[PDB]
Amino acid sequence: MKGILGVKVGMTRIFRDDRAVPVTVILAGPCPVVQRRTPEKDGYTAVQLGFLPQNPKRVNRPLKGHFAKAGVEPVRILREIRDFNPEGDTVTVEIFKPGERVDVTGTSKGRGFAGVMKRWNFAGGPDSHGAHKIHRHPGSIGNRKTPGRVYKGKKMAGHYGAERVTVMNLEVVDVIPEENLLLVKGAVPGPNGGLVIVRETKKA
Amino acid sequence: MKVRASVKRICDKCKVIRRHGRVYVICENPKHKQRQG
Amino acid sequence: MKTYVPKQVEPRWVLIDAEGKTLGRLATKIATLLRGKHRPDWTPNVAMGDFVVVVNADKIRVTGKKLEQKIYTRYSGYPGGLKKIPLEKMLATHPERVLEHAVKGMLPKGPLGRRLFKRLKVYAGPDHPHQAQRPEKLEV
Amino acid sequence: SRIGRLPIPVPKGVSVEVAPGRVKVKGPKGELEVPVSPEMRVVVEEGVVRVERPSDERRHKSLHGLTRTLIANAVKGVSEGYSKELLIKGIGYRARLVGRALELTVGFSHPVVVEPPEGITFEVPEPTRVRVSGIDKQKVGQVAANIRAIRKPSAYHEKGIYYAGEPVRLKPGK
RNA sequence: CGCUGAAAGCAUCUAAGCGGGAAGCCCGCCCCAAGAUGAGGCCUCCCACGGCAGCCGGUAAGGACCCGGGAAGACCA
RNA sequence: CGAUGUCGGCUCGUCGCAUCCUGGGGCUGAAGAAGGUCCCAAGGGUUGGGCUGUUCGCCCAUUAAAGCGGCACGCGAGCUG
Ligand SMILES: [Mg+2]
Ligand SMILES: [Mg+2]
Ligand SMILES: [Mg+2]
Ligand SMILES: [Mg+2]
Ligand SMILES: [Mg+2]
Ligand SMILES: [Mg+2]
Ligand SMILES: [Mg+2]
Ligand SMILES: [Mg+2]
Ligand SMILES: [Mg+2]
Ligand SMILES: [Mg+2]
Ligand SMILES: [Mg+2]
Ligand SMILES: [Mg+2]
Ligand SMILES: [Mg+2]
Ligand SMILES: [Mg+2]
Ligand SMILES: [Mg+2]
Ligand SMILES: [Mg+2]
Ligand SMILES: [Mg+2]
Ligand SMILES: [Mg+2]
Ligand SMILES: [Mg+2]
Ligand SMILES: [Mg+2]
Ligand SMILES: [Mg+2]
Ligand SMILES: [Mg+2]
Ligand SMILES: [Mg+2]
Ligand SMILES: [Mg+2]
Ligand SMILES: [Mg+2]
Ligand SMILES: [Mg+2]
Ligand SMILES: [Mg+2]
Ligand SMILES: [Mg+2]
Ligand SMILES: [Mg+2]
Ligand SMILES: [Mg+2]
Ligand SMILES: [Mg+2]
Ligand SMILES: [Mg+2]
Ligand SMILES: [Mg+2]
Ligand SMILES: [Mg+2]
Ligand SMILES: [Mg+2]
Ligand SMILES: [Mg+2]
Ligand SMILES: [Mg+2]
Ligand SMILES: [Mg+2]
Ligand SMILES: [Mg+2]
Ligand SMILES: [Mg+2]
Ligand SMILES: [Mg+2]
Ligand SMILES: [Mg+2]
Ligand SMILES: [Mg+2]
Ligand SMILES: [Mg+2]
Ligand SMILES: [Mg+2]
Ligand SMILES: [Mg+2]
Ligand SMILES: [Mg+2]
Ligand SMILES: [Mg+2]
Ligand SMILES: [Mg+2]
Ligand SMILES: [Mg+2]
Ligand SMILES: [Mg+2]
Ligand SMILES: [Mg+2]
Ligand SMILES: [Mg+2]
Ligand SMILES: [Mg+2]
Ligand SMILES: [Mg+2]
Ligand SMILES: [Mg+2]
Ligand SMILES: [Mg+2]
Ligand SMILES: [Mg+2]
Ligand SMILES: [Mg+2]
Ligand SMILES: [Mg+2]
Ligand SMILES: [Mg+2]
Ligand SMILES: [Mg+2]
Ligand SMILES: [Mg+2]
Ligand SMILES: [Mg+2]
Ligand SMILES: [Mg+2]
Ligand SMILES: [Mg+2]
Ligand SMILES: [Mg+2]
Ligand SMILES: [Mg+2]
Ligand SMILES: [Mg+2]
Ligand SMILES: [Mg+2]
Ligand SMILES: [Mg+2]
Ligand SMILES: [Mg+2]
Ligand SMILES: [Mg+2]
Ligand SMILES: [Mg+2]
Ligand SMILES: [Mg+2]
Ligand SMILES: [Mg+2]
Ligand SMILES: [Mg+2]
Ligand SMILES: [Mg+2]
Ligand SMILES: [Mg+2]
Ligand SMILES: [Mg+2]
Ligand SMILES: [Mg+2]
Ligand SMILES: [Mg+2]
Ligand SMILES: [Zn+2]
């Protein structure tokens, strides 16, 4: 397992073998190793990566000590990649090559309080033929005296988005190491400027 | 396999066996294979 | 004269080897110890029984076809959320829970009963981390 | 009218050592451990092993004949050894030896390769005759059955993989 | 559906034992999750402050308020 | 009976399995292909339209299939009427 922390920068498309290829562009590296998780000390294997240099003023003393222990300049974000133990002490975009398949995790765009139609694709109600103030309403939410209650997990309106989402098996279309750039075919969760995690895919 | 409540010898080559809690009839004639159920 | 009521007593730590013992017949004894009903000064509204440590809980034994046919059951509260787990799989995955479940069902319901269950410490394998309490070995 | 009491002739030189819950049979061709019920007593005599039961209840009567045959099969297995022959029938159907592996060409879109488990050796004398041989009687019949299952005898044609000596029973087509 | 195999000299997938075998079952994938009060783990930071398992006060690492805001958002977070 | 709102539709599901399809099987009067019959199996899936208030049903065009039942003949402090 290998992975890297990144920033979603934007979308475009390239031309490859006379095909337009939609791509999301990710500024991925470089990621200094900041802590390693070992079975003896932590009970599992992973690597805590850092990402983006931080104004040291904004780094309090417990964080400062953490960066010192593993002699590393102060960084804005710490995230672990599970079951990854890179040989070096810096993870860059070159762990992936064009043609590989990756999974990308982001924080999806936040819909706030979402209706039953936007969040769950409910059909809503008719817009004429007598329909009375229920055009976007959920309809029935149960039965009658049996069971006399509503199921856990019943689909209802509420906050929707700004949540962790992983899209799987994305083709790496290009790697530009001079710019720590990764080109991933298709759509990646969240807004431009959003933190993302790019890992080798779990689909065989 | 015939599955029924009455399992019986059909011909004289039929054998009534008990197998894993169930009465089967096995035979050289495949039509006669029976499981009680 | 009023019936004797005990002042707070230091509880007795005991150690029991579960290897080879019959699951439910061992559990009735452990619950007795947890309630402290072996004690001449038993009082039902205080926690005054023993602390019980158990080792080799994964080597507990069982009669008939229970390894395959005894089903533990968990209900999540969601539609279709009844999970059925057989004894076999539970012993292969969380063996200490087999004895833990048996004993819990034999303790009283309520706040004291739940407190008594916390005084039970069950370990798969021959070892336990309570050496500092110096548990007294019991043959039961 | 009793297998459990039939004494087991042990040829020289195969040795039979008895132990709790099992008996071990060494011979010119290997070792076999027979796991044996503790309720049964296995008795070593001059060139003869015998099995004795402790009562006449049904379970003891049933374990008695089993245990004698199990030990006898091991005795045969280390001295004589076991084998089972398979005959391939059908036009395109052939077999060949690929290293130690068995390759069957039996009408699929592809050859079927069977690896030998330890203690099993595959022989292909001619292309339509396969030999499964080993010291473990149960294992030999298992591997032979697996190879037959790859293309069982057809119900309408002399086509497939047969046990040597298996009668060819065809029902009519059209 | 078998292998080996008695009881029951034969036979038997079974009584001892072993194998194969479903979109189904467990796991594997994705998301939540230590109020998991059984409240877990690791890294790092602070420190033995005055007065009279308690109390009063001033600090420590830090935190909150306030303000500029935000593809975060009903408010709050 | 000092009130437990009714058919049908819409919306939203959820469950049973006597299974419509898909997966695994045995028997066949199973050559193959296609079927028939029984067994295991409830994970998912199970179309759009004409008629009629209809449920149902008939029909058109498809389909792997166009399953059958329970939930106050599920669901009117959710809508229709
Ligand atoms: Mg993120
Ligand atoms: Mg919003
Ligand atoms: Mg809505
Ligand atoms: Mg929508
Ligand atoms: Mg949606
Ligand atoms: Mg609609
Ligand atoms: Mg609409
Ligand atoms: Mg309408
Ligand atoms: Mg109106
Ligand atoms: Mg309106
Ligand atoms: Mg509604
Ligand atoms: Mg109603
Ligand atoms: Mg209820
Ligand atoms: Mg939110
Ligand atoms: Mg390119
Ligand atoms: Mg964006
Ligand atoms: Mg007759
Ligand atoms: Mg027969
Ligand atoms: Mg006692
Ligand atoms: Mg028992
Ligand atoms: Mg555990
Ligand atoms: Mg109880
Ligand atoms: Mg009570
Ligand atoms: Mg001898
Ligand atoms: Mg004697
Ligand atoms: Mg046989
Ligand atoms: Mg007979
Ligand atoms: Mg058995
Ligand atoms: Mg098996
Ligand atoms: Mg099996
Ligand atoms: Mg087989
Ligand atoms: Mg298997
Ligand atoms: Mg599939
Ligand atoms: Mg998490
Ligand atoms: Mg916690
Ligand atoms: Mg957590
Ligand atoms: Mg609990
Ligand atoms: Mg904690
Ligand atoms: Mg831990
Ligand atoms: Mg400050
Ligand atoms: Mg009334
Ligand atoms: Mg009233
Ligand atoms: Mg009233
Ligand atoms: Mg009223
Ligand atoms: Mg009516
Ligand atoms: Mg329904
Ligand atoms: Mg059924
Ligand atoms: Mg089917
Ligand atoms: Mg089928
Ligand atoms: Mg056919
Ligand atoms: Mg025909
Ligand atoms: Mg035909
Ligand atoms: Mg059929
Ligand atoms: Mg049948
Ligand atoms: Mg059947
Ligand atoms: Mg189903
Ligand atoms: Mg279901
Ligand atoms: Mg269904
Ligand atoms: Mg019309
Ligand atoms: Mg018209
Ligand atoms: Mg219509
Ligand atoms: Mg109609
Ligand atoms: Mg009309
Ligand atoms: Mg009608
Ligand atoms: Mg008509
Ligand atoms: Mg068609
Ligand atoms: Mg069909
Ligand atoms: Mg229709
Ligand atoms: Mg109904
Ligand atoms: Mg009715
Ligand atoms: Mg009616
Ligand atoms: Mg109704
Ligand atoms: Mg209805
Ligand atoms: Mg209604
Ligand atoms: Mg109304
Ligand atoms: Mg209505
Ligand atoms: Mg209502
Ligand atoms: Mg109402
Ligand atoms: Mg209502
Ligand atoms: Mg009501
Ligand atoms: Mg209407
Ligand atoms: Mg009207
Ligand atoms: Zn017959």
CA–CA distance, A62 with D151 (Å, rounded to integer): 70
Decide: CB of D6 under 7 A of nucleic strand E.
no
Q: For A41-144, list the strands marked E by DSSP.
A: 46-53, 75-82, 90-91, 101-107, 113-114
With beta carbons less than 8 A apart as the criterion, state whether A4 and A93 touch: yes
Decide: CB of A105 under 7 A of nucleic strand E.
yes
Residues in a beta bridge with D123:
D131
Residues 115-154 of A with CB under 7 A from strand E: none
Segment (H or E) for C23: helix C23-35
Q: How far is the CA of A128 from the C1' of F60 (A)?
A: 29
**Two structure tokens written together for C58:** 């994964």
CA–CA distance, A158 with A149 (Å, rounded to integer): 19
Residue A164, SS3? Answer: strand
Report which of A88, A90, A72, A105 is spatially closest to residue A30, judged by C-alpha positions.
A90
What single-letter amino acid sits at A123?
A
Report which of A148, A143, A187, A137 is spatially closest to residue A167, judged by C-alpha positions.
A187
**Two structure tokens written together for A168:** 């799987």
**Two structure tokens written together for D113:** 């390769």
CA–CA distance, A180 with A51 (Å, rounded to integer): 12
Protein residues with beta carbon less than 7 Å from any atom of strand F = A 120, 122-126, 129-134, 137-147, 151, 154-155; B 1-3, 30-31, 33, 37; C 79-80; D 155-156, 171, 173-174
With CA atoms as reference, the chain C residue closest to A152 would be: C78
| Inter-helix orientation angle C96-104/C23-35, to 10° | 60
Query: What is the side-by-side order of every strand in the sheet holding B15-19?
Result: B2-4, B34-36, B22-26, B15-19
With beta carbons less than 8 A apart as the criterion, state whether D101 and D114 touch: yes
Q: Which residues of chain C lie closer than 8 angstroms to A152, CB-CB?
A: 76-79, 81
Sign of the torsion angle spanned by Cα atoms D30, D36, D38, D42: negative
DSSP D89-151: ESTT-EEEEETTEEEEESSSSS-EEEPPPTT-EEE-SSTTEEEEEES-HHHHHHHHHHHHHHT
CA–CA distance, A114 with A157 (Å, rounded to integer): 6
Strands B15-19 and A164-176: unpaired
Q: Cis peptide leading into D92, omega within 30 of 0?
A: no
C-alpha distance from residue C32 to each of A116, C113, C140 (Å): 55, 12, 11
**Two structure tokens written together for A96:** 């992936």
**Two structure tokens written together for D80:** 């004589």
Q: Is B20 known as a binding-site position?
A: no
Rounded to the nearest whole angstrom, what is the distance from the C-alpha of residue D19 to the centroid of ligand 33?
52
Q: How far is the CA of A63 from the C1' of E51 (A)?
A: 36
With beta carbons less than 8 A apart as the criterion, state whether D2 and D50 touch: no
Rounded to the nearest whole angstrom, what is the distance from the C-alpha of residue C79 to the centroid of ligand 74?
22
CA–CA distance, C125 with C55 (Å, rounded to integer): 6
Q: How far is the CA of C8 from the C1' of F26 (A)?
A: 72
Q: For A39-194, list the strands marked E by DSSP.
A: 46-53, 75-82, 90-91, 101-107, 113-114, 158-159, 164-176, 181-185
CA–CA distance, A57 with A64 (Å, rounded to integer): 10
CA–CA distance, A171 with A102 (Å, rounded to integer): 6
With beta carbons less than 8 A apart as the criterion, state whether A178 and A28 touch: no
Burial class (CB in 10 A: 0-12, 13-18, 19+), B34: buried
Residue pointed to by tokens 């080993």: D134
From first CA to last CA, the distance across chain D in angstroms is 48
**Two structure tokens written together for A155:** 């689909």
Partner A contacted by C75 (CB < 8 A)? no
CA–CA distance, C31 with C23 (Å, rounded to integer): 13
∠ at Cα B11 (B9, B16), nearest 5°?
Answer: 30
Q: Is B32 known as a binding-site position?
A: yes
The phi and psi torsions of C90 (rounded to 5 degrees) equal -65, -40
Report which of A134, A196, A140, A137 is spatially closest to residue A165, judged by C-alpha positions.
A196
The phi and psi torsions of D13 (rounded to 5 degrees) equal -115, 95
With beta carbons less than 8 A apart as the criterion, state whether D13 and D26 touch: no
With beta carbons less than 8 A apart as the criterion, state whether C60 and C26 touch: yes
CA–CA distance, C138 with C33 (Å, rounded to integer): 11
With beta carbons less than 8 A apart as the criterion, state whether D14 and D31 touch: no
Report which of A97, A6, A98, A96 is spatially closest to residue A50, judged by C-alpha positions.
A6
Rounded to the nearest whole angstrom, what is the distance from the C-alpha of residue A107 to the centroid of ligand 1?
5
CA–CA distance, C79 with C50 (Å, rounded to integer): 41
Q: Which residues of chain A lie closer than 8 angstroms to C79, CB-CB?
A: 151-153
Strands C51-55 and C13-17: parallel
CA–CA distance, C85 with C83 (Å, rounded to integer): 7
**Two structure tokens written together for A65:** 């000590």
Other beta carbons within 10 angstroms of residue D117's beta carbon come to 12
CA–CA distance, D72 with D14 (Å, rounded to integer): 12
CA–CA distance, D52 with D36 (Å, rounded to integer): 12
DSSP D27-90: ETTEEEEEE--TTSEEEEETTEEEEE-S--SHHHHHHHHHHHHHHHHHHHHHHT-EEEEEEEES
With beta carbons less than 8 A apart as the criterion, state whether C107 and C36 touch: no
∠ at Cα A70 (A78, A80), nearest 5°?
Answer: 25
What single-letter amino acid sits at D162?
Y
From first CA to last CA, the distance across chain C in angstroms is 36
DSSP classification of residue C111: H
Report which of C21, C13, C32 is spatially closest to residue C106, judged by C-alpha positions.
C32
Residues 6+ apart with CB under 8 A from A95: A2, A4, A86
C-alpha distance from residue D24 to each of C39, D34, D53 (Å): 54, 6, 19
With beta carbons less than 8 A apart as the criterion, state whether D148 and D161 touch: yes
CA–CA distance, D12 with D27 (Å, rounded to integer): 9
Decide: CB of D69 under 7 A of nucleic strand E.
yes
Alpha-carbon gap: A154 to the closest alpha carbon of chain C (Å): 9
Q: What is the largest CA-CA distance in chain C?
A: 59
